[PDB]
PDB file of C-alpha atoms and ligand atoms in Angstrom:
ATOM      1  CA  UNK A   1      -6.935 -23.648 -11.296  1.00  0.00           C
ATOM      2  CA  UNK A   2      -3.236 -24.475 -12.283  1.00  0.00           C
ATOM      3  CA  UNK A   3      -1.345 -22.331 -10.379  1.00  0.00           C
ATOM      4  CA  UNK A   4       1.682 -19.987 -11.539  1.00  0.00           C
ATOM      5  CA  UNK A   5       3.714 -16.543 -10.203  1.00  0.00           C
ATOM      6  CA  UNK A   6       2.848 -13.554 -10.841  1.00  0.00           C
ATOM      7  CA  UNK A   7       5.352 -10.689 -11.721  1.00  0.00           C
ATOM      8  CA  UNK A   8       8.049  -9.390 -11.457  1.00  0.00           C
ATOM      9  CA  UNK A   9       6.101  -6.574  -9.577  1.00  0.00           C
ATOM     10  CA  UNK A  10       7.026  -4.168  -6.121  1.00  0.00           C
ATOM     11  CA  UNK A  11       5.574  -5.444  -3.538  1.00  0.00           C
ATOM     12  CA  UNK A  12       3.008  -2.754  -2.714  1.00  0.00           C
ATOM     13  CA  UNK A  13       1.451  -2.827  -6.050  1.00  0.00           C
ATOM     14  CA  UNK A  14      -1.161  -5.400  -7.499  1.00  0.00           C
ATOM     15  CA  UNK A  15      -0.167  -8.181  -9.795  1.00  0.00           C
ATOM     16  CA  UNK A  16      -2.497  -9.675 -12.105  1.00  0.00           C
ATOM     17  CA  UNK A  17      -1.600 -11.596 -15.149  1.00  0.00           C
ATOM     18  CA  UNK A  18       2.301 -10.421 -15.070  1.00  0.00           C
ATOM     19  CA  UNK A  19       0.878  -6.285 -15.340  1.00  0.00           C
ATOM     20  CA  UNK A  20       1.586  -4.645 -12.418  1.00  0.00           C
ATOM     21  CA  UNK A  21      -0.786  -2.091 -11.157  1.00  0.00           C
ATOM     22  CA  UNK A  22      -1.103   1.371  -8.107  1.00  0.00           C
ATOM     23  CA  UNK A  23      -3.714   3.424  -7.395  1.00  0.00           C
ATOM     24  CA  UNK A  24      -2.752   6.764  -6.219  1.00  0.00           C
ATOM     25  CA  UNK A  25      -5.564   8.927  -4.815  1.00  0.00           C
ATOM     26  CA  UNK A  26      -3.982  12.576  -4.384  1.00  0.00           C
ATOM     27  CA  UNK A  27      -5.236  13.406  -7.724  1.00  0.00           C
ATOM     28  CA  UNK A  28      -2.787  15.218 -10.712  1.00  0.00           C
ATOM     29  CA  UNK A  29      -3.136  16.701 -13.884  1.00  0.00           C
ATOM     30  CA  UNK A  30      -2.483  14.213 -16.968  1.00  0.00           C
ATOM     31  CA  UNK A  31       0.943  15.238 -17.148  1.00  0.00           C
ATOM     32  CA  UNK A  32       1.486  15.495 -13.207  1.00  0.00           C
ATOM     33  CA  UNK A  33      -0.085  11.523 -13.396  1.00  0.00           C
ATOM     34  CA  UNK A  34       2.268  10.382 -15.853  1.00  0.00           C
ATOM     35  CA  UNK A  35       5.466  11.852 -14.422  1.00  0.00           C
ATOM     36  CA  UNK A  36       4.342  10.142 -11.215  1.00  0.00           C
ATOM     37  CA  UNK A  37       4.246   6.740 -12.829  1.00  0.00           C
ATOM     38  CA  UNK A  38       7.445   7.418 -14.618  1.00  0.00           C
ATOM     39  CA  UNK A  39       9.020   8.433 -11.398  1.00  0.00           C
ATOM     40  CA  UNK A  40       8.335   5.102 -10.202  1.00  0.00           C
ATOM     41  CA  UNK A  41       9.374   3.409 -13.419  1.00  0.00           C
ATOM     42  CA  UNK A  42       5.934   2.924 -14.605  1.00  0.00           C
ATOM     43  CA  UNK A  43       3.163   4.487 -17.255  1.00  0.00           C
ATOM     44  CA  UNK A  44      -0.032   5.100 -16.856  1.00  0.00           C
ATOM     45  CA  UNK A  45      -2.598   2.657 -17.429  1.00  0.00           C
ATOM     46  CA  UNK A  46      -2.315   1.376 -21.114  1.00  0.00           C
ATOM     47  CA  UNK A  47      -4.916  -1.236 -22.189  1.00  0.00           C
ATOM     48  CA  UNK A  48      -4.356  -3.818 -24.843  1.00  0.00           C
ATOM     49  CA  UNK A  49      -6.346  -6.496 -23.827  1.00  0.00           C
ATOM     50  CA  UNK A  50      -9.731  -7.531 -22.669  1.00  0.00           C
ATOM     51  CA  UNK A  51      -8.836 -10.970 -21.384  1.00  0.00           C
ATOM     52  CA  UNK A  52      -5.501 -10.116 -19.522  1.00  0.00           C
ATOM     53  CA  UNK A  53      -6.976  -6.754 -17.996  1.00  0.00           C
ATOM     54  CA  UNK A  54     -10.552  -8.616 -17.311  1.00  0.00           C
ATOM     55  CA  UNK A  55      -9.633  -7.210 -13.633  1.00  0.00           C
ATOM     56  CA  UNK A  56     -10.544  -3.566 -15.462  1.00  0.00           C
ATOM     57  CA  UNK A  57     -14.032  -4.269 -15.232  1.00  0.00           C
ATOM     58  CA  UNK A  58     -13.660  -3.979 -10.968  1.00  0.00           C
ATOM     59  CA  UNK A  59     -12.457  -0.558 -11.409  1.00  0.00           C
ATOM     60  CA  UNK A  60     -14.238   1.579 -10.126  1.00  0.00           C
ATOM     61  CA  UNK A  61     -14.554   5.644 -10.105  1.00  0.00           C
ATOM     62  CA  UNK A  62     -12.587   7.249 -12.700  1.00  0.00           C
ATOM     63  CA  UNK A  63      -9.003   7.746 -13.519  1.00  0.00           C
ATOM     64  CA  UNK A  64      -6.196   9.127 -15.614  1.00  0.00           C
ATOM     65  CA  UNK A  65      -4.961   6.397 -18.183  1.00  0.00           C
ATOM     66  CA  UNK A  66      -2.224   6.897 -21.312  1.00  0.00           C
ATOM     67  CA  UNK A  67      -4.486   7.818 -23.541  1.00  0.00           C
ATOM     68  CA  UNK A  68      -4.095  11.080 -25.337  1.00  0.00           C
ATOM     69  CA  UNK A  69      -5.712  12.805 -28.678  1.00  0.00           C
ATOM     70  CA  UNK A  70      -5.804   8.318 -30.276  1.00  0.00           C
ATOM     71  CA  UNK A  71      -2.481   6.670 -28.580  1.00  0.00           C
ATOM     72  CA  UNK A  72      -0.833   5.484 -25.600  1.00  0.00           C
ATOM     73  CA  UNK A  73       1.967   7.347 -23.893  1.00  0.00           C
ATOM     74  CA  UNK A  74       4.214   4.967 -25.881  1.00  0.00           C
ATOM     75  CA  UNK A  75       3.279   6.099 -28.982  1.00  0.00           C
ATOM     76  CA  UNK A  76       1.383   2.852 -29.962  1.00  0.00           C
ATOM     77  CA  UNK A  77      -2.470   4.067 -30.939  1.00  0.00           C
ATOM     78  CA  UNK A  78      -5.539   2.208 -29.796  1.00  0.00           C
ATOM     79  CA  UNK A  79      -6.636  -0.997 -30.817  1.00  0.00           C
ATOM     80  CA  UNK A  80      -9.804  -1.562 -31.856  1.00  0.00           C
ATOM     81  CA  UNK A  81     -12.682  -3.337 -29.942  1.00  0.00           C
ATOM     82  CA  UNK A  82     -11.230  -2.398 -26.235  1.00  0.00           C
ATOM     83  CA  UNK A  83     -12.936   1.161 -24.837  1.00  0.00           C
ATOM     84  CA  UNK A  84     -15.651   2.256 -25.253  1.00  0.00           C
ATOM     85  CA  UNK A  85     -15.037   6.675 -25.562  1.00  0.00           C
ATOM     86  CA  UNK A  86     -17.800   8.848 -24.500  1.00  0.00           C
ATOM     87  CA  UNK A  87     -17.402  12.646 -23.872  1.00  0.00           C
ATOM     88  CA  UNK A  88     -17.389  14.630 -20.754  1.00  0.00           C
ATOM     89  CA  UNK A  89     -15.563  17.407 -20.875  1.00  0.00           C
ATOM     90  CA  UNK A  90     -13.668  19.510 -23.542  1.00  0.00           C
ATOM     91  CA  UNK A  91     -10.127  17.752 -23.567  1.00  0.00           C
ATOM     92  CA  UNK A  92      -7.705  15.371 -25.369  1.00  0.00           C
ATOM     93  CA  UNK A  93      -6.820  13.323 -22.580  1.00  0.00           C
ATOM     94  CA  UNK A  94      -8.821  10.051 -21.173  1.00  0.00           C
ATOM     95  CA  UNK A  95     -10.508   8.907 -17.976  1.00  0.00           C
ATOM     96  CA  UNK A  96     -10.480   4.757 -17.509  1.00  0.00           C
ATOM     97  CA  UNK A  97     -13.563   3.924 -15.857  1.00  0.00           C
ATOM     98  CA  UNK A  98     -15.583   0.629 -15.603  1.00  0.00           C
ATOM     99  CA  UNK A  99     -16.329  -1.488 -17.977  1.00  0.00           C
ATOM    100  CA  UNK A 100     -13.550  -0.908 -20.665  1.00  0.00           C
ATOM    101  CA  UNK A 101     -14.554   2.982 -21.211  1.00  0.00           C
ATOM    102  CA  UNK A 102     -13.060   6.559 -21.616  1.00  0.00           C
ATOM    103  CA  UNK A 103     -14.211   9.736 -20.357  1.00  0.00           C
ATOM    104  CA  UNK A 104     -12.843  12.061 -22.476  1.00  0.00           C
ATOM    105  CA  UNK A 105     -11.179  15.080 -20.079  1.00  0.00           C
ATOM    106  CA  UNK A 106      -8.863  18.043 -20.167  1.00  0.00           C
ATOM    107  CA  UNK A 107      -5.871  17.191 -19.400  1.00  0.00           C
ATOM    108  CA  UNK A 108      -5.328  20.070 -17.449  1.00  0.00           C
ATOM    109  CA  UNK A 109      -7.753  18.160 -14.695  1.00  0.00           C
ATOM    110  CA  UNK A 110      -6.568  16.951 -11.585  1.00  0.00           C
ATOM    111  CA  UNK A 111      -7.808  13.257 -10.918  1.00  0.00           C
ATOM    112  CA  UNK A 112      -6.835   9.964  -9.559  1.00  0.00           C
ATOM    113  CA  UNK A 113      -4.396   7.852 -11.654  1.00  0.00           C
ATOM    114  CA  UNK A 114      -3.467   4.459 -12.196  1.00  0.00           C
ATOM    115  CA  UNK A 115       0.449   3.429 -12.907  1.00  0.00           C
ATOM    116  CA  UNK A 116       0.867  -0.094 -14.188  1.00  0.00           C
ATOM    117  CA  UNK A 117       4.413  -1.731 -14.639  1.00  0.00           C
ATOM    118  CA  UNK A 118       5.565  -4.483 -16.884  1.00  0.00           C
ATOM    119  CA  UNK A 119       9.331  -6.356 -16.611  1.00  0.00           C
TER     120      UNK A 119
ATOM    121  CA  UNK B   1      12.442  -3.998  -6.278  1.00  0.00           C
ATOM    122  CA  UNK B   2      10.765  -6.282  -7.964  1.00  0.00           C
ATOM    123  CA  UNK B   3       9.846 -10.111  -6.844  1.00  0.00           C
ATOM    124  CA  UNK B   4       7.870 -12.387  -7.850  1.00  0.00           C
ATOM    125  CA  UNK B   5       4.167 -13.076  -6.383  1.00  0.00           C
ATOM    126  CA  UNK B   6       2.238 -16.142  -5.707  1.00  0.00           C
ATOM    127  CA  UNK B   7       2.030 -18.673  -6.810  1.00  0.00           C
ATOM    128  CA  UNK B   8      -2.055 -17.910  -7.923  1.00  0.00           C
ATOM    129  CA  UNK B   9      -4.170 -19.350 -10.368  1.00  0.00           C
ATOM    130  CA  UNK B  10      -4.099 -17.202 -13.737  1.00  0.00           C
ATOM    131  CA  UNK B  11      -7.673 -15.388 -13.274  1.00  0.00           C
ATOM    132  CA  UNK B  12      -6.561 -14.218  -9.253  1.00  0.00           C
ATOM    133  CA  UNK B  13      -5.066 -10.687  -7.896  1.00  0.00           C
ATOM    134  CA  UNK B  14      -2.057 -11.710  -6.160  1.00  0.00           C
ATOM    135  CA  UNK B  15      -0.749  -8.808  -3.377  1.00  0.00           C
ATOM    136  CA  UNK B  16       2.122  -9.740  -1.325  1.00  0.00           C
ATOM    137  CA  UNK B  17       1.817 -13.613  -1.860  1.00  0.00           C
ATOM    138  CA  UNK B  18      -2.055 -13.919  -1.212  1.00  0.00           C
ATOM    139  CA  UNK B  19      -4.477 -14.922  -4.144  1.00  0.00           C
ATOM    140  CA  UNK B  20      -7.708 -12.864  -4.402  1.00  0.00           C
ATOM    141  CA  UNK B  21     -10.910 -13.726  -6.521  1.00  0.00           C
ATOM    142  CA  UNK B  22     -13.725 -11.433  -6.238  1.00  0.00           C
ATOM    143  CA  UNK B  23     -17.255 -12.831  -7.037  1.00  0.00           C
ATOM    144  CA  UNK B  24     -20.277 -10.815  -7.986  1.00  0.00           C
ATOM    145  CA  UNK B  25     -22.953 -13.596  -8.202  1.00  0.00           C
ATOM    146  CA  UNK B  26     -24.777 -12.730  -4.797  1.00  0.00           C
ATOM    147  CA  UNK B  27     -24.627 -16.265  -2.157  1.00  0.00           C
ATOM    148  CA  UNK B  28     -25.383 -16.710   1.463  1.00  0.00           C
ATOM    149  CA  UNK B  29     -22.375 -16.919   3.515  1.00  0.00           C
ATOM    150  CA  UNK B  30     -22.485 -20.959   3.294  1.00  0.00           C
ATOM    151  CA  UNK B  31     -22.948 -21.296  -0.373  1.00  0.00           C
ATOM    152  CA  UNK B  32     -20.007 -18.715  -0.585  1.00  0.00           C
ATOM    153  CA  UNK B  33     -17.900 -20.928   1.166  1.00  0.00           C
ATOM    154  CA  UNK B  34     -18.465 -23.337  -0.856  1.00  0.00           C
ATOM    155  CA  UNK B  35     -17.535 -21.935  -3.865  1.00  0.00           C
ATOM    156  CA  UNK B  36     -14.186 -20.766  -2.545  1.00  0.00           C
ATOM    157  CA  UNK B  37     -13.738 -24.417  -1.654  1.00  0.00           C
ATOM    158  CA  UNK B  38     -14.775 -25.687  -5.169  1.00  0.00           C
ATOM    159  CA  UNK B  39     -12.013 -23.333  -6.208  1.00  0.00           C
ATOM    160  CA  UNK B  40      -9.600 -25.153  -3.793  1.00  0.00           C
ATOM    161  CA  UNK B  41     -10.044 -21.719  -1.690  1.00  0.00           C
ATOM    162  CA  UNK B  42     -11.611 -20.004   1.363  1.00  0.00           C
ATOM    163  CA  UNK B  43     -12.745 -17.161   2.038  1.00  0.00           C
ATOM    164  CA  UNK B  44     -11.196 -13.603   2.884  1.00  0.00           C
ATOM    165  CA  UNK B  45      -9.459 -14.536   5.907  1.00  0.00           C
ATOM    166  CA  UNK B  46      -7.857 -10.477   7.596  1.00  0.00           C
ATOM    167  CA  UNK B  47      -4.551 -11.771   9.328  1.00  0.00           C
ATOM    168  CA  UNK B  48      -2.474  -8.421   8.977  1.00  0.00           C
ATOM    169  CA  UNK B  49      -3.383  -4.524   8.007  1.00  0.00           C
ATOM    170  CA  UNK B  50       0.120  -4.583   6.217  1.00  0.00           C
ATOM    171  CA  UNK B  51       0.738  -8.032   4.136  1.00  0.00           C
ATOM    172  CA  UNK B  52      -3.384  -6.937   3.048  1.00  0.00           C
ATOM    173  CA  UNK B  53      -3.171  -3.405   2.700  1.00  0.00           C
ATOM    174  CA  UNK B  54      -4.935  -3.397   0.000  1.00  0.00           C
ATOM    175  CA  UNK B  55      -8.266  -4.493   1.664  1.00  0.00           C
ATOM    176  CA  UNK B  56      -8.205  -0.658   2.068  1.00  0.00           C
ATOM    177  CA  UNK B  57      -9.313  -0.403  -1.470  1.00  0.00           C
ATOM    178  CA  UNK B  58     -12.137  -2.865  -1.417  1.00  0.00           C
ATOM    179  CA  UNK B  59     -15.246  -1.372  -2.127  1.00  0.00           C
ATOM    180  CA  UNK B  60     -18.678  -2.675  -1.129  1.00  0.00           C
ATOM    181  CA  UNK B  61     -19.181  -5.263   1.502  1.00  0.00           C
ATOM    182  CA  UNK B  62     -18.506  -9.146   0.613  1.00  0.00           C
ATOM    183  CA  UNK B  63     -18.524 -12.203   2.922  1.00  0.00           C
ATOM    184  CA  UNK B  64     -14.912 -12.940   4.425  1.00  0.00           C
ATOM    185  CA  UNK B  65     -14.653 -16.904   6.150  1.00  0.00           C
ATOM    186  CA  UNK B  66     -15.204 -14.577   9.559  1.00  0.00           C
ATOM    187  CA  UNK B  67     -18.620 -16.873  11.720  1.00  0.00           C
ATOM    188  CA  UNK B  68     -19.188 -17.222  15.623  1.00  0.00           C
ATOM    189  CA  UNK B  69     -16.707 -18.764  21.922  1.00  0.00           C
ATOM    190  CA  UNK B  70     -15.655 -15.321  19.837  1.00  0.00           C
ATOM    191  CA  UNK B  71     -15.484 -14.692  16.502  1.00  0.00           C
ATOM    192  CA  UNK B  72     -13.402 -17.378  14.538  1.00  0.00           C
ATOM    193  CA  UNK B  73     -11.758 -18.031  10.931  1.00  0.00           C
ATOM    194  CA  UNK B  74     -12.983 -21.142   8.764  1.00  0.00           C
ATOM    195  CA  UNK B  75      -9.888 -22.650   9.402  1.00  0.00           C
ATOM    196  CA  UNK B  76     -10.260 -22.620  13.688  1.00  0.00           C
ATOM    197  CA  UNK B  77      -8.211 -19.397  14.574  1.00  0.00           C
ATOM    198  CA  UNK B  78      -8.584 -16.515  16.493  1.00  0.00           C
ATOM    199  CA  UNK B  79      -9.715 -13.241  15.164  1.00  0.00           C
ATOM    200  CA  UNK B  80      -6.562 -11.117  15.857  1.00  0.00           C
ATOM    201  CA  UNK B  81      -7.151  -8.165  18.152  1.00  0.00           C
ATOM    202  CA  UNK B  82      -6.592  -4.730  16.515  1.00  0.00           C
ATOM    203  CA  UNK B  83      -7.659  -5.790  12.754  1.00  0.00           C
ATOM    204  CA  UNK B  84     -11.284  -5.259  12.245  1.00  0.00           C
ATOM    205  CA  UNK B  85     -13.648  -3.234  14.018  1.00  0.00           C
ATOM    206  CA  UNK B  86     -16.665  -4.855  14.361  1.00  0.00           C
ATOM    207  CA  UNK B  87     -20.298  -3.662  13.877  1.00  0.00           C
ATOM    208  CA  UNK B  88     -23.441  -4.627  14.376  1.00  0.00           C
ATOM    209  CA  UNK B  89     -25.419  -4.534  10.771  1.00  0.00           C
ATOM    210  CA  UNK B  90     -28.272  -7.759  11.207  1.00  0.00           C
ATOM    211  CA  UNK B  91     -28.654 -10.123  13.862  1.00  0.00           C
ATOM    212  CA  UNK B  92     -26.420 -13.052  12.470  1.00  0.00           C
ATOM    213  CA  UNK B  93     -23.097 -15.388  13.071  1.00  0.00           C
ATOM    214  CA  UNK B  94     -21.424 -14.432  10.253  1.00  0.00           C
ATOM    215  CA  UNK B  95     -19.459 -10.712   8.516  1.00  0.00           C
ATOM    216  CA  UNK B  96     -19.164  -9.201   5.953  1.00  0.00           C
ATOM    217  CA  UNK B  97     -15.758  -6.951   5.065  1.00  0.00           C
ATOM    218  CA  UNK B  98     -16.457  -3.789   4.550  1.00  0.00           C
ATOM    219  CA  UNK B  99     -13.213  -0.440   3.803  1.00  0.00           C
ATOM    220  CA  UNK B 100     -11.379   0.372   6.064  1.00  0.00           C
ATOM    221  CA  UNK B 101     -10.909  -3.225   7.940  1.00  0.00           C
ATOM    222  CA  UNK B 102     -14.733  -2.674   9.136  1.00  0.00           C
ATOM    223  CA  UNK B 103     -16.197  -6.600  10.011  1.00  0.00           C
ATOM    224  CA  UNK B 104     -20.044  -6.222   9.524  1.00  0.00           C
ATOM    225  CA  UNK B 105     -22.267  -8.579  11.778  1.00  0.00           C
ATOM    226  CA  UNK B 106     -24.762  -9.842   8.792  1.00  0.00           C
ATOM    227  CA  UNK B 107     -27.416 -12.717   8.703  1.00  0.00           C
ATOM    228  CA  UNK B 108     -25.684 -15.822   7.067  1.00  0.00           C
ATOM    229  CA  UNK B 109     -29.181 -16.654   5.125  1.00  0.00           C
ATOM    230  CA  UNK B 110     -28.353 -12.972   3.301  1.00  0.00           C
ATOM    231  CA  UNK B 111     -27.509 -13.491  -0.085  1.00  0.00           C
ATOM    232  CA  UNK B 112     -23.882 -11.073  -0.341  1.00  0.00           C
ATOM    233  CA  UNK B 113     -20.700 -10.623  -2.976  1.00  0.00           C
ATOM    234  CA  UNK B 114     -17.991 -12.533  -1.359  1.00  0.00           C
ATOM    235  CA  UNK B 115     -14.056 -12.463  -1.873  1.00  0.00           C
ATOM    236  CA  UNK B 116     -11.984 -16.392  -2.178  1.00  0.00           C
ATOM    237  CA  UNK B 117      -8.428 -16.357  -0.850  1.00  0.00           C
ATOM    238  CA  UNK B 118      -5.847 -18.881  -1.712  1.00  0.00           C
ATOM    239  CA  UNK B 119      -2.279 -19.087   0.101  1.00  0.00           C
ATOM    240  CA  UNK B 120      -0.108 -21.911  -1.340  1.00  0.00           C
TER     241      UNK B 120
HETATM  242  O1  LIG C 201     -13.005  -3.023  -4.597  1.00  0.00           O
HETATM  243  C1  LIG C 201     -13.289  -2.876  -5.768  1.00  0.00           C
HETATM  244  N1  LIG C 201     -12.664  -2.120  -6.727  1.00  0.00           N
HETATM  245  C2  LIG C 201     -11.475  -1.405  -6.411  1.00  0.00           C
HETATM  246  C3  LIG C 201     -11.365  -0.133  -7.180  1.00  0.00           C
HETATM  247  O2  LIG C 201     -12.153   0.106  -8.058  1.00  0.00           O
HETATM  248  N2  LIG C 201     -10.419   0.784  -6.782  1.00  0.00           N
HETATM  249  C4  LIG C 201     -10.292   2.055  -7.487  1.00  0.00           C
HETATM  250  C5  LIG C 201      -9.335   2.814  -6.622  1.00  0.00           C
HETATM  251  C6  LIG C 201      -9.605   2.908  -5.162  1.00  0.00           C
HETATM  252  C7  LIG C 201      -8.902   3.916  -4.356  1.00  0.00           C
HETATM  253  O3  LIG C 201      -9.771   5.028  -4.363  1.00  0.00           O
HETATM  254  C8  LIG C 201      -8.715   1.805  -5.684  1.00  0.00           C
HETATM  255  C9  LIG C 201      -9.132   0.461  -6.188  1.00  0.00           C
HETATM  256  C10 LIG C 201     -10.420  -2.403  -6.810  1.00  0.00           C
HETATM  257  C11 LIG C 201     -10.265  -2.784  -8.154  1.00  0.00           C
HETATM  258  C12 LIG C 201      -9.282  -3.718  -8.526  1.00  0.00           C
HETATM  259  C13 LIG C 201      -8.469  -4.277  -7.538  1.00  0.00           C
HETATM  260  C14 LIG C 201      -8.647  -3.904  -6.204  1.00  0.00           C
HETATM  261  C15 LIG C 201      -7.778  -4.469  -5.153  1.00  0.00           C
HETATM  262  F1  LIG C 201      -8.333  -4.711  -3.947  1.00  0.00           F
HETATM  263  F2  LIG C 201      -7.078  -5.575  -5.487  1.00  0.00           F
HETATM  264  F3  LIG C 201      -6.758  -3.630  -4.873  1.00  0.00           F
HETATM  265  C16 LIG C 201      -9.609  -2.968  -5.832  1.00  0.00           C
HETATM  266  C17 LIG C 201     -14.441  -3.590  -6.219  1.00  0.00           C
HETATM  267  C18 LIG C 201     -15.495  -2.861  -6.739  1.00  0.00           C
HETATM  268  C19 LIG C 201     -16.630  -3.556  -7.149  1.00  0.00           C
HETATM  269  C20 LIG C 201     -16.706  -4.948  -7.013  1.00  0.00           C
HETATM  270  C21 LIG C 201     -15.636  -5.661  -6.487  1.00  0.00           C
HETATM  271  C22 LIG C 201     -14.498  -4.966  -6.095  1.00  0.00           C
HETATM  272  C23 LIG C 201     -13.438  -5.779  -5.617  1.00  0.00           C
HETATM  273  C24 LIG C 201     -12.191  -5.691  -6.225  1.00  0.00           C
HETATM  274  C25 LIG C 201     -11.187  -6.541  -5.772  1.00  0.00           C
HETATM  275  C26 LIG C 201     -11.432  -7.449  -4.737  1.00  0.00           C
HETATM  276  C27 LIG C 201     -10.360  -8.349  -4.282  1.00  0.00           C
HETATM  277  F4  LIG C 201      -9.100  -7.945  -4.520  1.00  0.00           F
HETATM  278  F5  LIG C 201     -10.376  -8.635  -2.955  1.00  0.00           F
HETATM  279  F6  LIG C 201     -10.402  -9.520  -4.965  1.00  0.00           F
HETATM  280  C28 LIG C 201     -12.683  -7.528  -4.138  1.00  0.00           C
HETATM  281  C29 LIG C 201     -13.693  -6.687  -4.589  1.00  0.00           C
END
């Protein structure tokens, strides 16, 4: 209950734990997705923690994260006990959906994205 | 730009200087109150489509501090004209919120999700 700010985010996106976070719903390719978020000076979705992303597991549907065939946009791979990665269809990119999983995907796709921002 | 939001407690979604906690254990609308008070909280409480444009992206229907005068908040104001259009769901004297801005007439005794604000 102790109370502390949140950010620095934009004001239009969601702020939770100092990540900033947008849902954009005209759906993209991978690559389309992540040019997006960099356009914005962003990524897509990276996940690194259970407890500071806990809001993860109240997103719902499915959408483009950094995850690519595995590592983050970044270049800094997976850690271990976070998603869960099932198979879907043929690809080498990945899907966040809810609770902590991956869809595997073609990248080629077009789907929803998440950008999240950190200063 | 960036700013800074809140302040919120650690656990809370903070949009444009508003503190959001959603809850998933289902109450009646009185017991949900309560909790968001526990939490030193209210309910939802809709006072603008653009400082809580993000409602838009609420999915599912969860009890906001909305009870009937007209329809009033928990803390004695007016619902605003223009935010919310009401429907009738159950007969009842309390709503639900429901995407887009959609106020759901709902039996109070219904056990529901429900969504705390806090505002420092
Ligand atoms: O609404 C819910 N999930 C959204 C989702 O999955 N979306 C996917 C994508 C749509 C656009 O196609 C977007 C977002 C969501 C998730 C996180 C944050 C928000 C936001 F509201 F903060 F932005 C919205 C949801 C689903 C199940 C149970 C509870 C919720 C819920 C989430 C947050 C809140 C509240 F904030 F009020 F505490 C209340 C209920």
């Amino acid at each position: 209950l102790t109370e502390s700010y949140c950010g620095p985010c934009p004001k239009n996106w969601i702020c939770y734990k100092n990540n900033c976070y947008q849902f954009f719903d005209e759906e993209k390719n991978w690559y389309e997705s992540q040019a997006s978020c960099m356009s914005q000076n962003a990524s897509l979705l990276k996940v690194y923690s259970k407890e500071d992303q806990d809001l993860l597991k109240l997103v719902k549907s499915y959408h483009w994260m950094g995850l690519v065939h595995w590592q983050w946009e970044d270049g800094s791979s997976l850690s271990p006990n976070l998603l869960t990665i099932i198979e879907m269809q043929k690809g080498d990119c990945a899907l966040y959906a809810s609770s902590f999983k991956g869809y595997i995907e073609n990248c080629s796709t077009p789907n929803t994205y998440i950008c999240m921002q950190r200063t």
